[PDB]
Design a protein around this ligand. Structure first.
Ligand SMILES: CCCCCCCCCCCCCC(=O)O
Ligand SMILES: [Zn+2]
Ligand SMILES: [Zn+2]
Ligand SMILES: [Zn+2]
Ligand SMILES: [Zn+2]
Length: 267
């Protein structure tokens, strides 16, 4: 496939789920071979694993004293549409959460794709690999197409659920919203996070209840969102990824751990 950028500048704005502050994005077109990077207060922060500085409740990047929180969703949408060259200018300290999914980003960027004059240099998983952490596990193996399966084992009514994404089914995961369980809200607030969270941008679940009056968009919306997250974190490898992935209870921390190991193996 050929590298792609956006036809023109695209802007998005809104509160950040963690900072609770208003932030704005301006997605700028870039020439072939530029790659995906963020720009904040005069500093360019490449969308690569070397710049990850936090992964507990979001994937955050930083460089030279400048930090940007929650890049997982915008990066996942860019990965899914195979946008390879753009500069995401951020005026604020975090990417706007919007409705908690990648829908708005997806609809806008998809309508503004510009093919360029260079073959994409994909990151191709060359051999099987497995990373684990406290019962959580993620496996990656060779594949001509990006395939991602996420299996969750939740302590509430969700129980055991599984979802598989395959190329062409992008729309099945870009609408899945971020979620949190009521029993983890106290901790998130205590560590200085989740300041912008609300039922408008977060699916809040209880042991046996869904607080959002609109309910779930899909009975397995939570696992679809986790697949969406992994695809965003996988883009930290530096280019569109070709491989088959299986994540069991994975999260941003384990996702980045996998990315770093795959990168080391210069796979
Ligand atoms: C009662 C209003 C709801 C408060 C929402 C708390 C903030 C949401 C935390 C974000 C959870 C996603 C964590 C992740 O990125 O893996
Ligand atoms: Zn090609
Ligand atoms: Zn924490
Ligand atoms: Zn996240
Ligand atoms: Zn997410």
């Amino acid at each position: 496939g050929l590298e792609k950028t956006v036809k023109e500048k695209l802007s998005f704005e809104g509160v950040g789920i963690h900072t609770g502050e208003y932030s704005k994005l301006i997605i700028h077109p870039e020439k072939e071979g530029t790659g995906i990077r963020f720009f904040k207060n005069g500093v360019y922060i490449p969308a690569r694993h070397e710049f990850v500085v936090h992964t507990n409740h979001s994937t955050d990047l930083g460089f030279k004293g400048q930090r940007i929180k929650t890049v997982e969703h915008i990066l996942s949408v860019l990965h899914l549409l195979e946008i390879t060259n753009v500069t995401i200018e951020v005026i604020g300290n975090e990417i706007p959460i919007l409705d908690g999914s990648g829908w708005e980003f997806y609809e806008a960027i998809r309508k503004n794709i510009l093919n360029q004059n260079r073959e994409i240099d994909y990151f191709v998983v060359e051999e099987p690999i497995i990373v684990e952490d406290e019962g959580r596990l993620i496996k990656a193996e060779p594949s001509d197409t990006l395939e991602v399966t996420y299996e969750g084992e939740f302590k509430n009514f969700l129980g055991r659920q599984k979802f598989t994404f395959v190329e062409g089914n992008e729309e099945e995961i870009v609408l899945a919203r971020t979620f949190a369980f009521d029993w983890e809200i106290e901790h998130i607030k205590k560590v200085g996070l989740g300041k912008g969270g609300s039922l408008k941008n977060t699916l809040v679940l209880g042991k046996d209840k869904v607080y959002n009056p609109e309910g779930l968009r899909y009975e397995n919306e939570p696992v679809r969102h986790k697949v969406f997250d992994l695809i965003g974190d996988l883009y930290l490898l530096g280019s569109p990824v070709k491989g088959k992935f299986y994540s069991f209870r994975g999260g941003h921390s384990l996702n980045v751990k996998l990315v770093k190991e795959l990168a080391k193996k210069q796979k």
